[PDB]
Write an enzyme that holds these catalytic residues in place. Structure first.
Site, short mmCIF file in Angstrom:
data_model
loop_
_atom_site.label_atom_id
_atom_site.label_comp_id
_atom_site.label_asym_id
_atom_site.label_seq_id
_atom_site.Cartn_x
_atom_site.Cartn_y
_atom_site.Cartn_z
N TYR A 26 10.57 -39.82 -93.96
CA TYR A 26 11.20 -40.99 -94.57
C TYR A 26 12.24 -40.65 -95.63
O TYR A 26 12.17 -39.61 -96.28
CB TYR A 26 10.14 -41.95 -95.13
CG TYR A 26 9.51 -41.50 -96.43
CD1 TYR A 26 8.32 -40.77 -96.43
CD2 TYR A 26 10.10 -41.80 -97.66
CE1 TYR A 26 7.74 -40.35 -97.62
CE2 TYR A 26 9.52 -41.38 -98.86
CZ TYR A 26 8.34 -40.66 -98.83
OH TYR A 26 7.76 -40.24 -100.00
N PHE A 36 15.86 -42.86 -103.93
CA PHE A 36 14.83 -42.41 -104.86
C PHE A 36 13.90 -41.32 -104.31
O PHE A 36 13.26 -40.61 -105.08
CB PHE A 36 14.03 -43.59 -105.44
CG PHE A 36 13.43 -44.49 -104.40
CD1 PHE A 36 12.22 -44.17 -103.79
CD2 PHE A 36 14.06 -45.68 -104.04
CE1 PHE A 36 11.65 -45.01 -102.83
CE2 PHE A 36 13.50 -46.53 -103.09
CZ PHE A 36 12.30 -46.19 -102.48
N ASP A 37 13.84 -41.20 -102.98
CA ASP A 37 12.95 -40.22 -102.35
C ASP A 37 13.35 -39.90 -100.91
O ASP A 37 13.86 -40.76 -100.19
CB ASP A 37 11.51 -40.73 -102.37
CG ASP A 37 10.48 -39.61 -102.17
OD1 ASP A 37 10.86 -38.43 -102.07
OD2 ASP A 37 9.27 -39.93 -102.13
N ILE A 56 2.61 -49.22 -99.68
CA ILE A 56 3.08 -50.60 -99.83
C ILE A 56 3.05 -51.33 -98.49
O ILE A 56 3.24 -50.72 -97.43
CB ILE A 56 4.50 -50.69 -100.48
CG1 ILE A 56 5.52 -49.82 -99.73
CG2 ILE A 56 4.42 -50.30 -101.96
CD1 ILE A 56 6.97 -50.09 -100.10
N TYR A 82 6.88 -53.44 -104.32
CA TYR A 82 6.28 -53.32 -105.66
C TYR A 82 6.33 -54.60 -106.50
O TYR A 82 5.89 -54.61 -107.66
CB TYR A 82 6.87 -52.13 -106.41
CG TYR A 82 6.62 -50.80 -105.73
CD1 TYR A 82 5.39 -50.16 -105.85
CD2 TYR A 82 7.61 -50.20 -104.96
CE1 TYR A 82 5.15 -48.94 -105.21
CE2 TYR A 82 7.38 -48.99 -104.32
CZ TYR A 82 6.15 -48.36 -104.45
OH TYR A 82 5.93 -47.16 -103.83
N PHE A 99 13.88 -48.23 -96.25
CA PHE A 99 13.33 -46.96 -95.81
C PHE A 99 13.83 -46.59 -94.41
O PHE A 99 13.80 -47.42 -93.49
CB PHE A 99 11.80 -47.00 -95.79
CG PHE A 99 11.17 -46.89 -97.15
CD1 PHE A 99 10.88 -48.02 -97.90
CD2 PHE A 99 10.84 -45.64 -97.67
CE1 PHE A 99 10.27 -47.93 -99.15
CE2 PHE A 99 10.23 -45.53 -98.93
CZ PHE A 99 9.95 -46.67 -99.67
C1 LIG Z 1 5.05 -37.22 -105.11
O1 LIG Z 1 5.29 -38.13 -104.04
C2 LIG Z 1 4.31 -39.17 -103.98
C3 LIG Z 1 4.89 -40.42 -103.32
C4 LIG Z 1 6.08 -41.04 -104.05
C5 LIG Z 1 5.60 -41.85 -105.26
C6 LIG Z 1 6.74 -42.68 -105.85
C7 LIG Z 1 7.44 -43.53 -104.79
C8 LIG Z 1 8.62 -44.27 -105.40
C9 LIG Z 1 7.83 -42.69 -103.56
O2 LIG Z 1 8.91 -41.82 -103.91
O3 LIG Z 1 6.71 -41.91 -103.10
C10 LIG Z 1 8.22 -43.53 -102.36
O4 LIG Z 1 9.17 -43.20 -101.67
C11 LIG Z 1 7.46 -44.73 -101.98
O5 LIG Z 1 7.74 -45.80 -102.50
N1 LIG Z 1 6.48 -44.60 -101.07
C12 LIG Z 1 6.02 -43.34 -100.46
C13 LIG Z 1 6.14 -43.44 -98.94
C14 LIG Z 1 5.27 -44.59 -98.44
C15 LIG Z 1 5.70 -45.89 -99.10
C16 LIG Z 1 5.76 -45.82 -100.64
C17 LIG Z 1 4.38 -45.91 -101.24
O6 LIG Z 1 3.60 -46.79 -100.92
O7 LIG Z 1 4.03 -44.91 -102.24
C18 LIG Z 1 2.73 -44.98 -102.81
C19 LIG Z 1 2.80 -45.82 -104.09
C20 LIG Z 1 3.69 -45.18 -105.16
C21 LIG Z 1 1.44 -46.18 -104.71
C22 LIG Z 1 0.48 -46.95 -103.81
C23 LIG Z 1 1.08 -48.28 -103.32
C24 LIG Z 1 0.06 -49.07 -102.49
C25 LIG Z 1 -1.21 -49.35 -103.29
O8 LIG Z 1 -2.17 -50.01 -102.46
C26 LIG Z 1 -1.82 -48.07 -103.86
O9 LIG Z 1 -2.88 -48.43 -104.76
C27 LIG Z 1 -4.15 -47.93 -104.34
C28 LIG Z 1 -0.79 -47.23 -104.62
C29 LIG Z 1 2.27 -43.54 -103.03
C30 LIG Z 1 1.69 -42.94 -101.76
O10 LIG Z 1 2.20 -43.17 -100.68
C31 LIG Z 1 0.47 -42.06 -101.86
C32 LIG Z 1 0.27 -41.22 -100.60
C33 LIG Z 1 -0.74 -42.94 -102.08
C34 LIG Z 1 -1.32 -43.14 -103.28
C35 LIG Z 1 -0.79 -42.48 -104.53
C36 LIG Z 1 -2.52 -44.05 -103.38
O11 LIG Z 1 -2.66 -44.83 -102.19
C37 LIG Z 1 -3.81 -43.28 -103.65
O12 LIG Z 1 -4.75 -44.20 -104.21
C38 LIG Z 1 -5.52 -43.62 -105.26
C39 LIG Z 1 -4.38 -42.66 -102.39
O13 LIG Z 1 -5.15 -43.29 -101.69
C40 LIG Z 1 -3.99 -41.25 -102.01
C41 LIG Z 1 -3.94 -41.07 -100.49
C42 LIG Z 1 -4.94 -40.25 -102.67
C43 LIG Z 1 -4.29 -38.91 -103.01
C44 LIG Z 1 -5.17 -38.10 -103.95
C45 LIG Z 1 -2.92 -39.13 -103.61
C46 LIG Z 1 -1.82 -38.56 -103.10
C47 LIG Z 1 -0.53 -38.85 -103.72
C48 LIG Z 1 0.61 -38.63 -103.07
C49 LIG Z 1 1.88 -38.97 -103.73
C50 LIG Z 1 3.09 -38.74 -103.19
C51 LIG Z 1 3.25 -38.08 -101.85
#
Ligand SMILES: CO[C@H]1C[C@@H]2CC[C@@H](C)[C@@](O)(O2)C(=O)C(=O)N2CCCC[C@H]2C(=O)O[C@H]([C@H](C)C[C@@H]2CC[C@@H](O)[C@H](OC)C2)CC(=O)[C@H](C)/C=C(\C)[C@@H](O)[C@@H](OC)C(=O)[C@H](C)C[C@H](C)/C=C/C=C/C=C/1C
Length: 107
Positions: A26, A36-37, A56, A82, A99
């Site tokens: 993506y 942004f990413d 999201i 968001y 995206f």
């Molecule tokens: C460094 O890169 C980051 C991702 C970045 C963060 C900032 C954003 C701009 C962004 O650049 O991605 C981005 O492009 C974006 O907006 N994304 C990522 C691509 C999918 C869509 C979107 C998104 O939803 O991000 C997500 C968004 C920011 C937050 C979530 C939004 C939905 C909501 O329901 C959730 O609350 C629960 C929070 C980030 C993610 O896709 C990651 C994978 C998922 C989470 C962090 C949470 O779901 C978490 O809950 C504890 C989990 O269940 C995970 C699996 C547990 C493990 C330990 C965490 C892994 C973390 C991985 C983080 C990664 C790769």
């Protein structure tokens, strides 16, 4: 909530099942603005599981309606992204997100 416009068609047959792990590439940007990413730049695909509220709403629902091999432009309204809160330090309140997503494989 999310509009999907095909860049490259998938097989039109193989769609994500509930609880499956989707492997995608993506690039994310604010509508007509800043990128942004991108997972494509670091050459490492992004993985997430459906039905776990991991991403999201617009992203999950966008990927869920795509078949394997499909690449698409996902336009996601603020309510499916968001919302009024935004994402701290990166995404402003009420941001429409775009995206570029490719569904690489299901596992
Ligand atoms: C460094 O890169 C980051 C991702 C970045 C963060 C900032 C954003 C701009 C962004 O650049 O991605 C981005 O492009 C974006 O907006 N994304 C990522 C691509 C999918 C869509 C979107 C998104 O939803 O991000 C997500 C968004 C920011 C937050 C979530 C939004 C939905 C909501 O329901 C959730 O609350 C629960 C929070 C980030 C993610 O896709 C990651 C994978 C998922 C989470 C962090 C949470 O779901 C978490 O809950 C504890 C989990 O269940 C995970 C699996 C547990 C493990 C330990 C965490 C892994 C973390 C991985 C983080 C990664 C790769």
């Amino acid at each position: 909530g999310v509009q999907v416009e095909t860049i490259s068609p998938g097989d039109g047959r193989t769609f994500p099942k509930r609880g499956q792990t989707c492997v995608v590439h993506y690039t994310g940007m604010l509508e007509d603005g800043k990128k942004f990413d991108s997972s494509r730049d670091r050459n490492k695909p992004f993985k997430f599981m459906l039905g776990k509220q991991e991403v999201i709403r617009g992203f999950e629902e966008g990927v869920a309606q795509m078949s394997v091999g499909q690449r698409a432009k996902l336009t996601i309204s603020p309510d499916y992204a968001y919302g009024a809160t935004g994402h701290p330090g990166i995404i402003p309140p009420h941001a429409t997100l775009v995206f570029d997503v490719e569904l690489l494989k299901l596992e």
